[model samples]
Target chain A: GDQICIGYHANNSTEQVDTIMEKNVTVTHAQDILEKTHNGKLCDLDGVKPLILRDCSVAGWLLGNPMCDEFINVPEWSYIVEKANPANDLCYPGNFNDYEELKHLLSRINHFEKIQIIPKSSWSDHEASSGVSSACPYQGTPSFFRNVVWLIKKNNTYPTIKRSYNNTNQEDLLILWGIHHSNDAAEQTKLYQNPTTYISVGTSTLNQRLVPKIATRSKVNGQSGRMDFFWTILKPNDAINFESNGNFIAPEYAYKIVKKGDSAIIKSEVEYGNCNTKCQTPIGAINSSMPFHNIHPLTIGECPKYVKSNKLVLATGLRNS
Target chain B: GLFGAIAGFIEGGWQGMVDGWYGYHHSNEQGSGYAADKESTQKAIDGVTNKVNSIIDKMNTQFEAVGREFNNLERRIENLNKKMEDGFLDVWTYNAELLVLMENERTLDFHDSNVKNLYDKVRLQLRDNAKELGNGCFEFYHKCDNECMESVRNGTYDYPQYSEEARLKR
Candidate 1:
């Protein structure tokens, strides 16, 4: 914890207005307008702006630091899923196409017995009043609701990967490691658990009051359950880029190992969760120890660009694949 | 040929217009008090106009004179291009075309003022003279140290006070 840097994955907007308001809105007044709409406040009947509240989950980071906090320099947010979220409504498997790998990888972790795919999205007054715009990156309000895969490792291990997106896969399994903030009073809600494996997937709130109420109608069937979080909101690519440059440290823990002999090789072990509680135990503790140790040191050849080697596992057949 | 001569003539005419304008202004400023009237103004304008017209006429004469030179340069270039298109890749064709191109460039140099340093010496002299004038020494003799020294010693040297002539043109 020695002056460690922490970065959260975030669902970012390229549009300047949405980017600034969500990423940099630290003032109380700014947070007020954000919460009102995100919490389902009704807009005038004529229909409010669709672009206005697309990044609802941004309120978490925006309001995290009070406007008065002087050293609170909010970092730039970037997208990991490039060109995946387009204005026109198009989707593979009815959601982002890359999560297939994540689901496969989560199944391999020894900790949690049960793993669940949660769609991290939100529905707000905009979706309620004027109807959400298809133009809003995520189908509904710009909540962190994308696709998150939760992992419950074996034997009381902490619940990590509360929202693992495609960053983990056969093609690209690079985990982001950083620290969680303690002041916001946010808590993670247990979602799914393999009782036999003692692994559980859950949801969490960044701010106590800002935690969205679970709507029965909005609930996705167990087969298609969605968590309201974004990998971008949870792990901004800029923050990752910054991490790549040895700047921001994501709250998750990850380690990298390189092997050399007849072949050059690389592997990783990473653990990520929304809250310290989720990051700590019956599942959190397990992710922190043994297999979940965060020590991703960069390879000598790859150096800085692959500094987070501690958190990445390069796939086989990469030269051709 | 036509454009070459035309350009030369135009250069001359432009120079003449400038000089005529200079003289008209000088006369107007130095004319005896009673002579500096509407008639003087009319004469100045007429002189400048005439100089400009004569320069234009010279340009036309030069253009006519260069017509053949221009045609020859064009024909040589056309032949070179045709040879290139004909796949003349051997040393003979390459060298022949190269020699023709070089010769054409040299001939064209007569009118290609952009690359020529032909007026460098005269241009330097004019620049020096202008700089001297700019420093308030407008009289031709004031610009000549020998004459200015003598005039200054005799008290007949009339160094001009700052004048608009040096300042306004720039």
Candidate 2:
């Protein structure tokens, strides 16, 4: 239940500013806030520029129709960061932490107690923490208030949240996803046996700016196994020799999601290794254990302008991979 | 810390990756008597897969031609969706998708394993192509950066770019 700006606010007297940048705002909350103050504009990225933000948009309500987001414009964002500068950690070059970077970005805007940053595509059904409203600035059918970023004001009202970040004792209220897919994903929570036989492959550089909660969380703890997203341009039915002629060498575990056509790998090319795969070490989730998962085409609408087709679509691309 | 380099040319020698993906990919036996045989087979599959992957890479590139990338993609999705309905009953569609994928296969400057670049560049290319077809970009929620979006909507979009107070002083 709050509003925040994304563009530059002058240092001295708040003079010269990107009016267009200042105009766009999102409905967010305390949970989604970042570590620093974000000026609310693509150009405001503190690190090296993100190609995605170049001539891009975030779908904060208006793209064309009077009903949904208005003012429709095609090809608003660019994805040309093939060789993004190494210094720009914001792009998440395979090993970078997006949550931390986005948090750092929001930290620039000091006011909120805490903030969380996630790719808009991260949440399948974004209605989780969002509520709908039809206040000023908008007229017709009311949209979910959760659609925009809401800032938690330091007011005198503090209610008890059932699941505190520090509290791990309580039955963890897990965030669920998918339609009937949850019926399958419920099994996803269970651990799987990591492959003993494995291979290695080259890494993609373009994804230096993209990652997900699982990968981000992977860097957090070493006690447990991590889930990675290994992918190929091939589809499910298509075949890929992951253990290709010794071309595959053991490097690490974890496969970050890639483009739409990419088929997930299920062999030894897993993502968690110090120097070599531990014999008794139980590797789960990250590597594909032989037979791939069920295949399914993406079944989601491209709304809110800024959808991570690779991330969301890939998750659902294979029903149970 | 129980796992280590636990693989090397196993007994049967890995094979069938390029043939089909029904039930061919096999793991090498831990300590193989003829593991070298499997290495060659593994290498063969690797070569075949690399060729197929490169072909796909070439076809996926955005060529402003009269190709059916979207139509092909649509058919490919159709194939996938069909698989979802009846498991593997959708092989007919899958076979047809292969042909479509091979359609209008033109060579671009260079192909890349970098899928993001294509995903990013092709989207914009297609968007502009749609613009040529008279379309509008409307992914605007909060990350608004495109000025063309407003113009594309024919100036119907009416929202102040600055805050009420910000607008007052300016």
Candidate 3:
């Protein structure tokens, strides 16, 4: 299945000296070329063999022992572009030939190979270095991993995928990554001592960016000091609503998208009050789609001293349609 | 002595006749008036002495009664003064206790209001935060769903649109 047709030329011109069709190729072939070029075995094109092209054009050429710097110049590397465009003939699965297709396929295969290459005996050592130690042997390819290749290809994006629950179950890999207290002993200890805040990326699905959620976990005067709010872009005349635990309500807080110089601003009415009173004080005004910057002090139930700042909270609410 | 005695008898008889006439006139006028005047003056002096003595005795009795009544009045006034002082003390004590109770009630009211205010403010903030978070998550889910639809339209993946389809295939 990993086969491609190629046209080879003696010089830089488009006149093909030979046509190699439906040649069986492996992921190791591409890896070998990458490794050799990185080690300076093929720095100059003159010393290398004749260039192979995916099309009749000289611009659509693939180098033998190609360097990472030359990856942008080759048509085979055009699969790295995130969006599909008809004007740029090199864009994704829509315009990709077998050579371009196999390059991406081998790249994914190589990523999986690295995960399998780690020996079970030295897993503890590997875990200590990578901050993830596994006690069990790796389970072979699960259904999710098999389907994830197609999902990623369809989305045209790469995600940080990791095994969940300390790698106990192979099928429980989550496509979300972030700084977590549960993942680090020192962080976990700090949180246990002075429970204040936590941050994490939400689960990634097909054709979506990883969503980030920041929450406070402080216990102030025997009451939870957790606060949750998010911002995102909305379509013109879109109805504003909020959902909680599957129940929906019209929000008390008002949010509007306003143009500020070059970028758009997501503004929310801020108020401070107890349960009976309305929130009148403005606390945070952050950039749209960017992490929350310049967090002010938050107080809940005589916990002014316990409230901290500068935590990154990501906004999520944009629609492709 | 016989001649002299006969002469003397004749003179004496003449003097006796003169003396008898004078005595009759004196007894009728001077002797009667003197005796009556003496008796009446004695009666008048006795009556005046008795009346003065009775007035002095009545005045003495009335002075003794007035003294006794003054002493009784003084004793009653002292008792009344003592009762008034005790009643005043009781009233003062009751007022002090009532003041203290009122002050305590005011203090309790102040504390209750403060605690209630704090509880209310914290609860409001929490509810608002929860609503905001819910809205944010919902928006993210909507965006992801739209992207999935776009991928299907673009023919990037040969898969079904619904999550039920994925489950069924599995």
Candidate 4:
């Protein structure tokens, strides 16, 4: 087993909150150890995984090293449900229309069996208590970043059309994706300089003590027992520059689930990227390995003004029902 | 027209009384020669007295009519105020309740748990709350319109009465 030196840095700062010199540190092994040591519990909603990684250092490390080739070698359609056509520079052309076909394609995509939504940073208690925090609170407590977990569970009533309050059906797993305005000046300056730059790392800890709890009484009752989690990001929609060269980075990592010793072992397979490349007509060079291909640079459209705020917008085009 | 008639009667009575007194005084100044006409002068004095009394009675009636008008205006204003307060309360309460409902739904576990009941509840609550607020606003606007129309008809329409703050606050 080989050893690796990992250090986590605060955004735009030289000071590192944590550094780990661990032995046998492959990404999978390291993630497992970190998950066991993390502050919150990780649970799977059917295949959608929502987790709280209390430690900021681990989150910082993961964001710092986002490129992965392990899952790259996996079959294109095996883990990647959607395909990008470099010819049209569109990811999941079926998304434009033919939602049923898109849904069918998603069902076949193997990677949905396990997915992870990682936090970009720790929950800021100081920000929450002071009431200056822009982030939406988790269970009434302030959260520093916006990380949502959307779970579409499997029930006996399979293939039923799910409708939101707006009367639209649920369509894509990448239901919502966008960036928020960063408070840190240094981070802001960096983002302005390089629109494609990754901002922070994501880490996981094992303590579930401080985890925000949602009482059953407050839960939303939906058809097919669908559930969703939203963490408020302090930045408002106007403040977030979604069209910064059509590139916005969100903190979400897709992982393949492996069973090990009575617990699920999660490994990073896809890194979320928005508008990383400009594609031409017949853009076949587009990679299907990306989890949210439709929103990629090639085929992605502008962020709708109505949903520009931190409001939830149902992906009607991607709805399965 | 009642006020105008009363005013005309008072003016005419005063004119007659002044004429009667002047004529009687002039006759008296004519000395003992007019003394024989003193009886007729007494009758004219009596007539002036009676006219003054009738004018006083008409004025009293006019005063009562004016008082009644004032009271009616006051009651109308009080009713308008009550309608305004009630409309505002309904809208304000509906908005506050709606906010709380949203916050509660927002905090729920929509990921791993079955919150369909909560979701459906929130949706219905939101629709109902919005409808309530809209109805209140509509009612308030119509009330203001009616009040304004009354003021205009009474020739007392003030620009400030139609101000946006008054309309919205009302």
Q: For each candidate, give its TM-score against the true structure.
A: 0.16, 0.14, 0.13, 0.14
Q: What digit string (tens of lDDT, one per residue) describes model 3 on residues A100-123? A: 323332222211111221122322
For candidate 1, what is the DockQ? 0.01
Q: Give the distance in Å from residue A39's predicted Cα in candidate 2 to where it truly belongs.
A: 26
State how far residue A31 of model 3 sits from its true place (Å).
Answer: 86
Candidate 3 DockQ, CA atoms: 0.00
Q: What is the DockQ of each candidate?
A: 0.01, 0.01, 0.00, 0.00
Kindly list the per-residue Cα lDDT of model 1 for residues A214-300, writing each as its tens digit.
223332222122222222222222112211111111222221111111111111121222221111111111112111122222111
lDDT of 3: 0.21
Model 3 misplacement above 4 A: A1-321, B1-73, B130-170
Candidates ranked, most accurate by lDDT first: 4, 1, 3, 2
Error of 4 at A78 (Å): 19
lDDT of 4 at A126: 11
Q: What are the Cα lDDT values of the candidates?
A: 0.22, 0.21, 0.21, 0.23
Task: Name the candidate that leads on lDDT.
Answer: 4
Off by over 4 Å in 2: A1-321, B1-35, B42-46, B58-170
Task: Give per-residue CA lDDT, model 2, range A1-321, as digits (tens).
Answer: 011111100111111111111211111100110111111122201222122311212111111112333212222211111111212111111221122222222212211111122223332322222312232123654432122221111222212111112212212111101000011222223211111112332222112111112212322222121222222222222222222111011111111112222111111112222221101111221111211112222111110111111111000000000
Judged by TM-score, which candidate is best? 1
lDDT of 3 at B76: 82
lDDT of 1 by residue, B70-132 (tens): 123368865665555344223333332233234233322222232122123222333322333
